[PDB]
């Protein structure tokens, strides 16, 4: 029956979106747990697209039994979601190359997600609008994923194996790891249950696609814009946490409440603006260009919203907190006598508002146990929690949240037009190949690369490493400058190309 297939496919869309969100929100926890850099985390993130690419070319040439193959794909999604959860049981207790299992689980999840989109619409249109409703129901998945991630990032990583009354660290600390594994396991089981109710010439067209200058210009433009979007959304949680002193759970919840309603209303507003005012193709291009310009201006607005580097004695200041400075920092007399491994990540700030690296490096000699230190020579009383962010950074964070809402809304309106502004410029009998080649280019060159080379620069901005393991303190000014300048340099040539596109598209003959 068609109704049963519709329900099963809706559940499959929900599971796909939930798995994507679960993977996206857990990245920083993976970096902390496995002591890996952000470039490696970006590689793990792009392994999903790698797995999708390894199998999309096959399905694109074979159709067999579509419901059975979709069920197999969702089963592989669940298996990949659980494989990534397995290192929790296969590892020891977290202490404040196992990431290969996470990488392969993400790859398996991508291989499983590949069948659902093409085979689903093939079965939908073969036996009989539906795609929009399916996307609307799949929009439920992000909701569930964001809620579960926000709930699980505030539960300790070793929950159920420790008494939890002995955990010294807090979610606001830079060593906290949540229960990301649970989120992954829940997504895996949901995908498995979604799987259950299921088993019940060319190169000449390729040349033409390229010989089309408008198609090539639009492909480069969409590639740049989508790469910027992917590189921004991959590290938006991490950037918020490391820039505005927010916990992982709070960041996940706030980014979810920012994204879900905005995306839900943008997917509709962008497609309603065209049909309501009867936009021509050049009108659609101008619409998308204006949305891109507004988004670019808002991205420019992020630059003044950069909180300064925290006053840390040893990285941004001298060890006594007297002068400013981050490598090979010399020892002050008050600190030289109390020698320390010079590598003790023990965030403990002083009432001076200056964070110190460790109680030994702060010159503290006595401890209360809430922990308070006494007779800290170079602190001129301490507190084990590192000094938090300043009101000014809090107001900047509020402005950042508002601008993020507006930017997310504008992004959806601009995106919906893109696909509609890449097929209407291609022959009707060749639109399928145009969509497929555009999908391969954007998914490969953005999903596989943008996380990696964004994370490489992010690591370049790091100021304190663990063990190198996971970054401890990020240079906030450098972090913001790199994280926003990369997006700006990816979006500006896209704008120059848009005008070129508008300049060239207009003079064309349109029937």
């Amino acid at each position: 029956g068609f109704k049963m297939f519709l329900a099963a496919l809706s559940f499959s869309y929900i599971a796909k979106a939930l798995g994507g969100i679960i993977m996206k929100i857990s990245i920083t926890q993976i970096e902390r747990r496995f002591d890996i850099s952000s470039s490696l985390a970006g590689l793990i993130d792009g392994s999903f697209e790698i797995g999708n690419l390894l199998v999309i070319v096959f399905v694109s040439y074979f159709g067999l039994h579509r419901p059975k193959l979709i069920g197999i794909g969702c089963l592989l999604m669940g298996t990949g979601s659980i494989l990534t959860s397995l290192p929790h049981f296969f590892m020891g207790y977290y202490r404040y190359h196992m990431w290969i299992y996470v990488f392969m689980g993400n790859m398996l999840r991508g291989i499983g997600e590949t069948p659902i989109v093409p085979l689903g619409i093939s079965y939908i249109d073969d036996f009989a609008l539906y795609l929009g409703s399916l996307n609307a129901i799949g929009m439920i998945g992000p909701v569930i994923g964001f809620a579960l991630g926000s709930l699980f990032a505030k539960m300790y990583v070793d929950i159920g194996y420790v008494d939890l009354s002995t955990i010294r660290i807090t979610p606001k600390d830079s060593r906290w790891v949540g229960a990301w594994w649970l989120g992954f396991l829940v997504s895996g089981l949901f995908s498995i249950i979604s799987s259950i109710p299921f088993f019940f010439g060319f190169f000449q067209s390729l040349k033409s696609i390229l010989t089309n200058p408008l198609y090539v210009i639009f492909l480069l433009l969409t590639l740049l814009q989508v790469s910027s979007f992917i590189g921004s959304f991959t590290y938006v949680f991490k950037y918020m946490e490391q820039q505005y002193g927010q916990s992982a759970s709070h960041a996940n919840f706030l980014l979810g409440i920012i994204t879900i309603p905005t995306v839900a209303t943008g997917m509709f507003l962008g497609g309603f603006i065209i049909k309501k005012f009867k936009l021509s193709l050049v009108g659609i291009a101008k619409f998308s260009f204006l949305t891109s310009m507004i988004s670019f201006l808002f991205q420019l607005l992020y630059f003044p919203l950069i909180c300064e580097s925290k006053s840390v004695a040893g990285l941004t200041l001298t060890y006594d907190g007297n002068n400013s400075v981050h490598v090979d920092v010399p020892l002050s007399y008050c600190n030289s006598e109390c020698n320390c491994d010079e590598s003790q990540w023990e965030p403990v700030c002083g009432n001076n508002g200056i964070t110190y690296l460790s109680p030994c490096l702060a010159g503290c000699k006595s401890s209360s146990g809430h922990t308070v230190f006494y007779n800290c020579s170079c602190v001129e009383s301490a507190h084990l929690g590192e000094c938090p962010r300043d009101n000014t950074c809090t107001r900047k964070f509020f402005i950042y949240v508002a601008i993020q809402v507006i930017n997310s809304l504008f992004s959806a309106t601009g995106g919906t037009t893109f696909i509609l502004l890449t097929v209407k410029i291609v022959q009707p009998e060749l639109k399928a190949l145009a969509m497929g080649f555009q999908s391969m280019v954007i998914r490969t060159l953005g999903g596989i690369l943008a996380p990696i080379y964004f994370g490489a620069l992010i690591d370049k901005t790091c100021m304190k490493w663990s063990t190198q393991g996971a970054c401890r303190i990020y240079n906030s000014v450098f972090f913001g400058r790199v994280y926003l300048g990369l997006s700006i340099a990816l979006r500006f040539p896209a704008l120059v190309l848009y005008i070129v596109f508008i300049f060239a598209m207009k003079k064309k003959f349109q029937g």
């Epitope: 010989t211 089309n212 200058p213 408008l214 198609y215 209407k424 022959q427 003959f509 349109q510």
Partner: antibody, heavy 125, light 101 residues
Framework: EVQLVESGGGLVQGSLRLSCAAS????????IHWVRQAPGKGLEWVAS????????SYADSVKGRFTISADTSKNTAYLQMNSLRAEDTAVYYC??????????????????????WGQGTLVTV | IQMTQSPSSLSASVGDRVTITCRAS??????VAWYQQKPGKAPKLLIY?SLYSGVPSRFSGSRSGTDFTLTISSLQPEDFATYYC?????????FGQGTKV
């Protein structure tokens, strides 16, 4: 080296498929237009099509019995007639708009008049 | 959308000024073209208010808003053919009547 060769002109009692093979320019950023010239009469526009997409334009006299297509790979454009009554016995030209070739970027400009025509096929009814 | 040339037949000598004027009745736009069609040949684009490359510097086009006019400084024996003014809008192509000799 822009060329536009038309072939397919023959006596018909009716239907006929005529072609406008192109060369010397990027076919994708171009358009093809058919012009009818009755013997002793003036030029008359018949149909038009864009090569980058499926966009077509048609004339009032020929809408319900004239079809125009284009094969990008073949680098040619095609025109179809049906129900050939005794009023389409003219000579058929094929023409393209002007194309600018700054660097390797090729784009047409409809504001510019046809800069390259065809020889023409005589259709007899 | 529609353009018509009143002069049509126009006889003149070697040293003479030729003026061909046609008016855009509907949907006026600056996209006007001038074609010279020798008997039994394909038309040739001349004015289109800019000189096409390879055309001698004696053809000129002008317009006051509706009066599109093609002028020849001297009528040489080599341009005793028919002339057409052409409106090339988007999705629409129209032609005049024809001005010969």
């Amino acid at each position: 080296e822009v060329q536009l060769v038309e072939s397919g002109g023959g006596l018909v009692q009716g239907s006929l498929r005529l072609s406008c093979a192109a060369s010397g320019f990027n076919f994708s950023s171009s358009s093809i237009h058919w012009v009818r010239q009755a013997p002793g009469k003036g030029l008359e526009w018949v149909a038009s099509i864009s090569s980058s997409s499926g966009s077509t334009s048609y004339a009032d006299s020929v809408k319900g019995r004239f079809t125009i297509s284009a094969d990008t790979s073949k680098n040619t454009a095609y025109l179809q007639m049906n129900s050939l009554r005794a009023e389409d016995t003219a000579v058929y030209y094929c023409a393209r708009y002007y194309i600018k070739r700054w660097w390797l970027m090729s784009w047409e400009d409809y504001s510019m008049g046809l800069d390259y025509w065809g020889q023409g096929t005589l259709v007899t009814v | 959308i529609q353009m018509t040339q009143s002069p049509s037949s126009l006889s003149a000598s070697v040293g003479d000024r030729v003026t061909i004027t046609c008016r855009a009745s509907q949907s006026v736009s600056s996209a006007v073209a001038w074609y010279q069609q020798k008997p039994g040949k394909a038309p040739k684009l001349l004015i289109y208010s800019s000189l096409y490359s390879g055309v001698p510097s004696r053809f000129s086009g002008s317009r006051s808003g509706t009066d599109f006019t093609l002028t020849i400084s001297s009528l040489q024996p080599e341009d005793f053919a028919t002339y057409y003014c052409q409106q090339s809008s988007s999705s629409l192509i129209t032609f005049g009547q024809g001005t010969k000799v």
